[PDB]
């Protein structure tokens, strides 16, 4: 649940 924002 840390790298979930980096997606975009």
Known sequence: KF???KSR
Do not use: V
Request: cysteine-free.
């Open 3 to 5: 790298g979930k924002n």
